[PDB]
Design a binder for this molecule. Structure first.
Ligand SMILES: [Br-]
Ligand SMILES: [Br-]
Ligand SMILES: [Br-]
Ligand SMILES: [Br-]
Ligand SMILES: [Br-]
Ligand SMILES: [Br-]
Length: 185
């Protein structure tokens, strides 16, 4: 049900976390496989262009069609790497998802997923950020903030300077560069 981000979050967590739980041998043999799991289970619920547009800010409008295309393709690769690296710590832990609350007229909704430690250590909080398309009523995720670390605003200052000194092509090259870093465990 696309008009309720709590239902979508539940389903997306179920698919993503079950696959990370059940394919640990493959992940241990090649941690970059995490990109594939992220790509296939989680990114269908993520509005990749919306997230990319937030990072790009004022530089979007003046960018050329080719520059835009290259930027968005690099950004999507970066998201696979980032979500992959952030979820590498998940290997089958129990998790709890914040319960459904009134949506009212809201168009942005954060939803906390808590990863429970099996030994009673403190939990790890993943705050997924959901946005509504007000024309269609449908929701998609655009960020996941992992104990305060955002996939898109954490590097805002460095990416701001890079855009200002080298434009969108500078940032695209940097996103590509980051996406080629080996995921580690
Ligand atoms: Br335009
Ligand atoms: Br690329
Ligand atoms: Br565990
Ligand atoms: Br559960
Ligand atoms: Br502890
Ligand atoms: Br839509």
């Amino acid at each position: 049900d696309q008009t309720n981000p709590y239902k979508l979050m539940d389903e997306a967590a179920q698919k993503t976390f079950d696959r990370l739980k059940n394919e640990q041998p493959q992940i241990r043999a090649n941690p970059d496989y995490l990109r594939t799991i992220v790509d296939q289970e989680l990114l269908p619920y993520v509005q990749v262009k919306y997230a990319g547009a937030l990072v790009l800010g004022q530089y979007y409008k003046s960018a050329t069609p080719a520059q835009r295309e290259a930027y968005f393709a690099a950004f999507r690769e970066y998201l696979k790497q980032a979500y992959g690296q952030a979820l590498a710590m998940y290997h089958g832990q129990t998790y709890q998802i914040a319960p459904e609350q009134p949506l009212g007229d809201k168009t942005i909704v954060p939803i906390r997923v808590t990863i429970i430690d099996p030994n009673g250590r403190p939990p790890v909080r993943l705050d997924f950020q959901w946005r509504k398309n007000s024309q269609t009523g449908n929701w998609q995720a655009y960020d996941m903030i992992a104990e305060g670390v955002s996939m898109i605003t954490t590097k805002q200052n460095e990416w701001g300077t890079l855009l200002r000194t080298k434009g969108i092509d500078g940032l695209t090259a940097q996103l590509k560069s980051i996406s080629q870093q080996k995921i580690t465990l």
